[PDB]
Write a protein that holds these residues in place. Structure first.
Motif, PDB file in Angstrom:
ATOM      1  N   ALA A  96      -2.325  14.660   7.907  1.00  0.00           N
ATOM      2  CA  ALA A  96      -3.490  14.557   8.793  1.00  0.00           C
ATOM      3  C   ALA A  96      -3.506  13.293   9.688  1.00  0.00           C
ATOM      4  O   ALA A  96      -4.477  13.075  10.414  1.00  0.00           O
ATOM      5  N   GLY A  97      -2.448  12.478   9.628  1.00  0.00           N
ATOM      6  CA  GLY A  97      -2.338  11.279  10.453  1.00  0.00           C
ATOM      7  C   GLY A  97      -2.319   9.929   9.756  1.00  0.00           C
ATOM      8  O   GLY A  97      -2.124   8.912  10.427  1.00  0.00           O
ATOM      9  N   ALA A  98      -2.515   9.879   8.415  1.00  0.00           N
ATOM     10  CA  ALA A  98      -2.481   8.590   7.699  1.00  0.00           C
ATOM     11  C   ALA A  98      -1.063   8.084   7.608  1.00  0.00           C
ATOM     12  O   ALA A  98      -0.125   8.834   7.896  1.00  0.00           O
ATOM     13  N   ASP A  99      -0.886   6.806   7.215  1.00  0.00           N
ATOM     14  CA  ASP A  99       0.465   6.277   7.068  1.00  0.00           C
ATOM     15  C   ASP A  99       0.697   5.758   5.642  1.00  0.00           C
ATOM     16  O   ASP A  99      -0.235   5.643   4.849  1.00  0.00           O
ATOM     17  N   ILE A 100       1.960   5.501   5.311  1.00  0.00           N
ATOM     18  CA  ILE A 100       2.348   5.068   3.972  1.00  0.00           C
ATOM     19  C   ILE A 100       1.602   3.825   3.476  1.00  0.00           C
ATOM     20  O   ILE A 100       1.316   3.743   2.284  1.00  0.00           O
ATOM     21  N   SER A 101       1.247   2.892   4.375  1.00  0.00           N
ATOM     22  CA  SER A 101       0.531   1.665   3.974  1.00  0.00           C
ATOM     23  C   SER A 101      -0.815   1.944   3.330  1.00  0.00           C
ATOM     24  O   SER A 101      -1.331   1.090   2.608  1.00  0.00           O
ATOM     25  N   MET A 102      -1.356   3.162   3.516  1.00  0.00           N
ATOM     26  CA  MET A 102      -2.650   3.518   2.925  1.00  0.00           C
ATOM     27  C   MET A 102      -2.565   4.044   1.484  1.00  0.00           C
ATOM     28  O   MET A 102      -3.590   4.375   0.879  1.00  0.00           O
ATOM     29  N   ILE A 103      -1.333   4.061   0.894  1.00  0.00           N
ATOM     30  CA  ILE A 103      -1.077   4.529  -0.474  1.00  0.00           C
ATOM     31  C   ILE A 103      -2.070   4.033  -1.559  1.00  0.00           C
ATOM     32  O   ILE A 103      -2.446   4.797  -2.450  1.00  0.00           O
ATOM     33  N   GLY A 104      -2.440   2.752  -1.487  1.00  0.00           N
ATOM     34  CA  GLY A 104      -3.340   2.116  -2.445  1.00  0.00           C
ATOM     35  C   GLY A 104      -4.725   2.728  -2.505  1.00  0.00           C
ATOM     36  O   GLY A 104      -5.346   2.732  -3.567  1.00  0.00           O
ATOM     37  N   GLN A 105      -5.188   3.303  -1.380  1.00  0.00           N
ATOM     38  CA  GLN A 105      -6.500   3.975  -1.323  1.00  0.00           C
ATOM     39  C   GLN A 105      -6.502   5.252  -2.182  1.00  0.00           C
ATOM     40  O   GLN A 105      -7.570   5.778  -2.500  1.00  0.00           O
ATOM     41  N   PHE A 106      -5.309   5.706  -2.623  1.00  0.00           N
ATOM     42  CA  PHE A 106      -5.169   6.908  -3.446  1.00  0.00           C
ATOM     43  C   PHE A 106      -4.811   6.621  -4.909  1.00  0.00           C
ATOM     44  O   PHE A 106      -4.552   7.540  -5.670  1.00  0.00           O
ATOM     45  N   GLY A 107      -4.785   5.336  -5.280  1.00  0.00           N
ATOM     46  CA  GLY A 107      -4.493   4.876  -6.636  1.00  0.00           C
ATOM     47  C   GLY A 107      -3.062   5.066  -7.114  1.00  0.00           C
ATOM     48  O   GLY A 107      -2.802   5.028  -8.317  1.00  0.00           O
ATOM     49  N   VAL A 108      -2.116   5.270  -6.186  1.00  0.00           N
ATOM     50  CA  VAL A 108      -0.714   5.494  -6.557  1.00  0.00           C
ATOM     51  C   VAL A 108       0.226   4.411  -5.965  1.00  0.00           C
ATOM     52  O   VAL A 108       1.436   4.649  -5.813  1.00  0.00           O
ATOM     53  N   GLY A 109      -0.355   3.248  -5.653  1.00  0.00           N
ATOM     54  CA  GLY A 109       0.323   2.106  -5.048  1.00  0.00           C
ATOM     55  C   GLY A 109       1.571   1.649  -5.775  1.00  0.00           C
ATOM     56  O   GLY A 109       2.486   1.170  -5.124  1.00  0.00           O
ATOM     57  N   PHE A 110       1.642   1.783  -7.116  1.00  0.00           N
ATOM     58  CA  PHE A 110       2.879   1.362  -7.817  1.00  0.00           C
ATOM     59  C   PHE A 110       4.119   1.969  -7.189  1.00  0.00           C
ATOM     60  O   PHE A 110       5.130   1.290  -7.065  1.00  0.00           O
ATOM     61  N   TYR A 111       4.065   3.271  -6.817  1.00  0.00           N
ATOM     62  CA  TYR A 111       5.252   3.942  -6.264  1.00  0.00           C
ATOM     63  C   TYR A 111       5.773   3.394  -4.948  1.00  0.00           C
ATOM     64  O   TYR A 111       6.937   3.636  -4.618  1.00  0.00           O
ATOM     65  N   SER A 112       4.976   2.555  -4.261  1.00  0.00           N
ATOM     66  CA  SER A 112       5.402   1.881  -3.032  1.00  0.00           C
ATOM     67  C   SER A 112       6.556   0.901  -3.335  1.00  0.00           C
ATOM     68  O   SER A 112       7.264   0.495  -2.421  1.00  0.00           O
ATOM     69  N   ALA A 113       6.769   0.554  -4.644  1.00  0.00           N
ATOM     70  CA  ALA A 113       7.900  -0.277  -5.065  1.00  0.00           C
ATOM     71  C   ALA A 113       9.219   0.347  -4.558  1.00  0.00           C
ATOM     72  O   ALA A 113      10.152  -0.387  -4.205  1.00  0.00           O
ATOM     73  N   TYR A 114       9.263   1.705  -4.461  1.00  0.00           N
ATOM     74  CA  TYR A 114      10.463   2.421  -3.991  1.00  0.00           C
ATOM     75  C   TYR A 114      10.773   2.310  -2.474  1.00  0.00           C
ATOM     76  O   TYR A 114      11.838   2.741  -2.021  1.00  0.00           O
ATOM     77  N   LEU A 115       9.894   1.637  -1.729  1.00  0.00           N
ATOM     78  CA  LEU A 115      10.152   1.296  -0.314  1.00  0.00           C
ATOM     79  C   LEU A 115      11.264   0.259  -0.239  1.00  0.00           C
ATOM     80  O   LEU A 115      12.003   0.224   0.747  1.00  0.00           O
ATOM     81  N   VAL A 116      11.362  -0.623  -1.268  1.00  0.00           N
ATOM     82  CA  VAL A 116      12.332  -1.714  -1.232  1.00  0.00           C
ATOM     83  C   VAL A 116      13.317  -1.752  -2.385  1.00  0.00           C
ATOM     84  O   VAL A 116      14.321  -2.459  -2.278  1.00  0.00           O
ATOM     85  N   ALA A 117      12.997  -1.063  -3.509  1.00  0.00           N
ATOM     86  CA  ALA A 117      13.808  -1.085  -4.720  1.00  0.00           C
ATOM     87  C   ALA A 117      14.580   0.191  -4.934  1.00  0.00           C
ATOM     88  O   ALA A 117      14.019   1.276  -4.799  1.00  0.00           O
ATOM     89  N   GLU A 118      15.865   0.060  -5.296  1.00  0.00           N
ATOM     90  CA  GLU A 118      16.678   1.228  -5.663  1.00  0.00           C
ATOM     91  C   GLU A 118      16.404   1.576  -7.154  1.00  0.00           C
ATOM     92  O   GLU A 118      16.594   2.703  -7.572  1.00  0.00           O
ATOM     93  N   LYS A 119      15.939   0.602  -7.932  1.00  0.00           N
ATOM     94  CA  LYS A 119      15.605   0.760  -9.352  1.00  0.00           C
ATOM     95  C   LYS A 119      14.426  -0.141  -9.673  1.00  0.00           C
ATOM     96  O   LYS A 119      14.347  -1.259  -9.164  1.00  0.00           O
ATOM     97  N   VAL A 120      13.524   0.343 -10.526  1.00  0.00           N
ATOM     98  CA  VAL A 120      12.386  -0.460 -10.971  1.00  0.00           C
ATOM     99  C   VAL A 120      12.394  -0.479 -12.480  1.00  0.00           C
ATOM    100  O   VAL A 120      12.524   0.577 -13.120  1.00  0.00           O
TER     101      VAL A 120
END
Ligand SMILES: Cc1ccc(S(=O)(=O)c2cc(C)nc(N)n2)cc1
Length: 210
Positions: free
Chosen positions: A109-133
Protein backbone atom coordinates in the motif's frame (compact mmCIF):
# COMPACT_ATOMS: atom_id res chain seq x y z
CA UNK A 1 22.60 -30.81 21.76
CA UNK A 2 21.42 -28.50 18.89
CA UNK A 3 17.70 -28.38 17.95
CA UNK A 4 16.65 -27.14 14.46
CA UNK A 5 13.24 -25.55 13.92
CA UNK A 6 11.37 -24.22 10.88
CA UNK A 7 10.17 -20.61 11.06
CA UNK A 8 6.45 -20.14 10.55
CA UNK A 9 5.86 -19.60 6.81
CA UNK A 10 4.89 -15.89 7.40
CA UNK A 11 8.20 -15.20 9.23
CA UNK A 12 10.22 -16.99 6.50
CA UNK A 13 8.42 -14.77 3.91
CA UNK A 14 9.11 -11.61 6.00
CA UNK A 15 12.80 -12.59 6.22
CA UNK A 16 13.00 -13.22 2.42
CA UNK A 17 11.43 -9.79 1.76
CA UNK A 18 13.98 -8.07 4.03
CA UNK A 19 16.90 -9.87 2.34
CA UNK A 20 15.61 -9.52 -1.26
CA UNK A 21 13.99 -6.07 -1.48
CA UNK A 22 16.23 -3.30 -2.84
CA UNK A 23 16.22 -0.74 0.01
CA UNK A 24 19.23 1.52 0.71
CA UNK A 25 18.26 2.88 4.19
CA UNK A 26 19.63 -0.20 6.05
CA UNK A 27 20.89 1.80 9.11
CA UNK A 28 17.40 1.55 10.72
CA UNK A 29 18.24 -2.00 11.91
CA UNK A 30 20.14 -0.39 14.83
CA UNK A 31 17.21 1.79 15.98
CA UNK A 32 14.97 -1.34 15.91
CA UNK A 33 17.31 -3.47 18.03
CA UNK A 34 17.97 -0.64 20.53
CA UNK A 35 14.16 -0.17 20.72
CA UNK A 36 13.74 -3.92 21.47
CA UNK A 37 16.44 -3.63 24.18
CA UNK A 38 14.68 -0.55 25.71
CA UNK A 39 11.32 -2.47 25.76
CA UNK A 40 13.03 -5.48 27.53
CA UNK A 41 14.68 -3.12 30.05
CA UNK A 42 11.29 -1.38 30.67
CA UNK A 43 9.77 -4.87 31.34
CA UNK A 44 12.35 -5.96 33.97
CA UNK A 45 12.26 -2.44 35.61
CA UNK A 46 8.42 -2.66 35.86
CA UNK A 47 8.42 -6.23 37.26
CA UNK A 48 11.16 -5.35 39.81
CA UNK A 49 8.80 -2.77 41.43
CA UNK A 50 6.51 -5.50 42.85
CA UNK A 51 9.29 -8.17 43.13
CA UNK A 52 12.77 -6.64 43.90
CA UNK A 53 14.47 -10.08 43.86
CA UNK A 54 14.01 -10.04 40.03
CA UNK A 55 17.15 -7.75 40.07
CA UNK A 56 19.29 -10.34 41.99
CA UNK A 57 20.64 -11.29 38.50
CA UNK A 58 21.91 -7.69 38.04
CA UNK A 59 20.69 -4.22 39.06
CA UNK A 60 22.30 -2.25 36.17
CA UNK A 61 19.85 -1.51 33.30
CA UNK A 62 21.84 -0.59 30.22
CA UNK A 63 22.68 -1.21 26.55
CA UNK A 64 26.19 -1.88 25.16
CA UNK A 65 27.11 -1.64 21.47
CA UNK A 66 30.18 -3.72 20.74
CA UNK A 67 31.80 -3.70 17.29
CA UNK A 68 34.50 -6.29 16.52
CA UNK A 69 36.41 -5.87 13.21
CA UNK A 70 38.34 -9.18 13.60
CA UNK A 71 35.10 -11.28 13.82
CA UNK A 72 33.13 -8.78 11.61
CA UNK A 73 30.36 -8.66 14.25
CA UNK A 74 28.29 -5.88 15.83
CA UNK A 75 26.78 -6.97 19.17
CA UNK A 76 23.83 -5.18 20.85
CA UNK A 77 23.78 -6.23 24.56
CA UNK A 78 21.07 -5.38 27.09
CA UNK A 79 20.40 -6.32 30.71
CA UNK A 80 16.63 -6.45 30.02
CA UNK A 81 14.13 -9.18 30.99
CA UNK A 82 15.66 -11.78 28.64
CA UNK A 83 13.84 -14.67 26.99
CA UNK A 84 12.91 -18.15 28.18
CA UNK A 85 13.31 -21.13 25.76
CA UNK A 86 9.49 -20.91 25.10
CA UNK A 87 9.87 -17.17 24.20
CA UNK A 88 12.70 -17.97 21.74
CA UNK A 89 11.08 -20.96 20.03
CA UNK A 90 7.33 -20.29 19.98
CA UNK A 91 5.68 -17.38 21.88
CA UNK A 92 7.50 -14.51 20.18
CA UNK A 93 7.02 -15.93 16.64
CA UNK A 94 3.26 -16.45 17.34
CA UNK A 95 2.94 -12.71 18.26
CA UNK A 96 5.06 -11.81 15.17
CA UNK A 97 2.58 -13.57 12.78
CA UNK A 98 -0.12 -10.82 12.82
CA UNK A 99 2.51 -8.04 12.72
CA UNK A 100 4.10 -9.69 9.66
CA UNK A 101 0.76 -9.81 7.75
CA UNK A 102 -0.09 -6.15 8.60
CA UNK A 103 3.45 -5.05 7.58
CA UNK A 104 3.43 -6.88 4.23
CA UNK A 105 -0.04 -5.29 3.59
CA UNK A 106 1.30 -1.80 4.52
CA UNK A 107 4.27 -2.32 2.12
CA UNK A 108 1.93 -3.26 -0.82
CA UNK A 109 0.00 0.00 0.00
CA UNK A 110 3.05 2.34 -0.12
CA UNK A 111 4.87 1.89 3.25
CA UNK A 112 8.61 1.26 3.38
CA UNK A 113 10.88 -1.18 5.25
CA UNK A 114 11.91 1.48 7.85
CA UNK A 115 8.35 1.29 9.25
CA UNK A 116 8.88 -2.38 10.38
CA UNK A 117 8.94 -1.41 14.11
CA UNK A 118 5.35 -0.09 13.96
CA UNK A 119 4.34 -3.77 13.34
CA UNK A 120 6.31 -5.26 16.29
CA UNK A 121 8.62 -7.34 14.05
CA UNK A 122 11.67 -4.99 14.15
CA UNK A 123 14.10 -7.76 15.22
CA UNK A 124 14.00 -9.17 11.65
CA UNK A 125 15.45 -5.88 10.30
CA UNK A 126 18.80 -7.37 11.58
CA UNK A 127 18.77 -9.26 8.21
CA UNK A 128 19.23 -5.93 6.30
CA UNK A 129 22.91 -6.03 7.37
CA UNK A 130 23.63 -9.52 8.81
CA UNK A 131 24.14 -12.78 6.90
CA UNK A 132 23.77 -14.61 10.29
CA UNK A 133 22.31 -13.56 13.65
CA UNK A 134 23.17 -15.21 16.97
CA UNK A 135 21.02 -14.35 19.99
CA UNK A 136 22.28 -15.22 23.50
CA UNK A 137 19.60 -14.73 26.16
CA UNK A 138 19.02 -15.38 29.88
CA UNK A 139 15.63 -14.90 31.66
CA UNK A 140 15.33 -15.24 35.48
CA UNK A 141 13.02 -18.29 35.06
CA UNK A 142 15.24 -20.27 32.65
CA UNK A 143 18.79 -21.24 31.66
CA UNK A 144 21.00 -19.39 29.13
CA UNK A 145 20.24 -20.19 25.45
CA UNK A 146 21.82 -19.46 22.07
CA UNK A 147 19.41 -18.96 19.11
CA UNK A 148 20.89 -18.73 15.64
CA UNK A 149 19.77 -18.29 12.05
CA UNK A 150 21.18 -17.54 8.61
CA UNK A 151 17.55 -17.36 7.34
CA UNK A 152 16.77 -19.98 4.65
CA UNK A 153 13.65 -21.02 6.63
CA UNK A 154 15.20 -22.44 9.82
CA UNK A 155 16.81 -21.49 13.12
CA UNK A 156 18.61 -23.43 15.85
CA UNK A 157 18.42 -23.29 19.67
CA UNK A 158 20.96 -24.84 22.09
CA UNK A 159 21.65 -24.39 25.80
CA UNK A 160 24.56 -21.95 25.97
CA UNK A 161 27.76 -23.03 27.85
CA UNK A 162 29.58 -19.78 26.94
CA UNK A 163 30.32 -16.88 29.33
CA UNK A 164 27.26 -16.59 31.75
CA UNK A 165 25.32 -13.28 31.25
CA UNK A 166 23.34 -12.84 34.49
CA UNK A 167 20.18 -11.57 32.74
CA UNK A 168 19.38 -10.03 29.35
CA UNK A 169 19.84 -10.49 25.62
CA UNK A 170 22.84 -10.24 23.33
CA UNK A 171 22.15 -9.90 19.56
CA UNK A 172 25.29 -10.74 17.59
CA UNK A 173 25.14 -9.54 13.98
CA UNK A 174 27.56 -11.40 11.69
CA UNK A 175 27.71 -8.63 9.11
CA UNK A 176 27.50 -9.06 5.33
CA UNK A 177 30.84 -8.31 3.54
CA UNK A 178 29.58 -4.97 2.15
CA UNK A 179 28.06 -3.76 5.47
CA UNK A 180 31.30 -3.18 7.51
CA UNK A 181 30.51 0.58 7.91
CA UNK A 182 28.42 -0.58 10.94
CA UNK A 183 31.71 -1.49 12.77
CA UNK A 184 32.98 2.12 12.44
CA UNK A 185 32.82 4.28 15.58
CA UNK A 186 31.83 7.48 13.70
CA UNK A 187 29.06 5.63 11.84
CA UNK A 188 27.49 3.99 14.92
CA UNK A 189 27.61 7.36 16.86
CA UNK A 190 25.87 9.05 13.92
CA UNK A 191 23.08 6.42 13.80
CA UNK A 192 22.50 6.42 17.58
CA UNK A 193 22.31 10.27 17.61
CA UNK A 194 19.89 10.34 14.62
CA UNK A 195 17.49 7.55 15.72
CA UNK A 196 18.03 6.69 19.40
CA UNK A 197 18.91 9.98 21.20
CA UNK A 198 16.07 9.77 23.77
CA UNK A 199 16.37 6.11 24.88
CA UNK A 200 15.97 6.04 28.70
CA UNK A 201 19.00 3.85 29.45
CA UNK A 202 22.74 4.47 29.04
CA UNK A 203 24.05 3.31 25.61
CA UNK A 204 27.79 2.62 25.72
CA UNK A 205 29.52 2.39 22.39
CA UNK A 206 32.63 0.27 22.93
CA UNK A 207 35.73 1.07 20.91
CA UNK A 208 38.20 -1.31 19.36
CA UNK A 209 41.53 -2.31 20.86
CA UNK A 210 43.45 -2.41 17.51
C1 LIG B 1 15.28 -14.67 18.37
C2 LIG B 1 14.62 -13.40 18.90
C3 LIG B 1 13.32 -13.44 19.41
C4 LIG B 1 12.74 -12.25 19.88
C5 LIG B 1 13.48 -11.06 19.92
S1 LIG B 1 12.77 -9.58 20.57
O1 LIG B 1 12.98 -8.47 19.59
O2 LIG B 1 11.30 -9.84 20.80
C6 LIG B 1 13.61 -9.19 22.07
C7 LIG B 1 13.14 -9.69 23.29
C8 LIG B 1 13.83 -9.35 24.46
C9 LIG B 1 13.33 -9.87 25.81
N1 LIG B 1 14.97 -8.62 24.38
C10 LIG B 1 15.39 -8.14 23.19
N2 LIG B 1 16.46 -7.36 23.19
N3 LIG B 1 14.74 -8.45 22.04
C11 LIG B 1 14.78 -11.03 19.42
C12 LIG B 1 15.34 -12.20 18.90
Amino acid sequence: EVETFAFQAEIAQLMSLIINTFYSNKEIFLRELISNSSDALDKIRYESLTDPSKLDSGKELHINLIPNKQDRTLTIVDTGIGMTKADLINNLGTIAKSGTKAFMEALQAGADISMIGQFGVGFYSAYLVAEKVTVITKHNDDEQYAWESSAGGSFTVRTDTGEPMGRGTKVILHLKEDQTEYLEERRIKEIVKKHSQFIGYPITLFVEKE
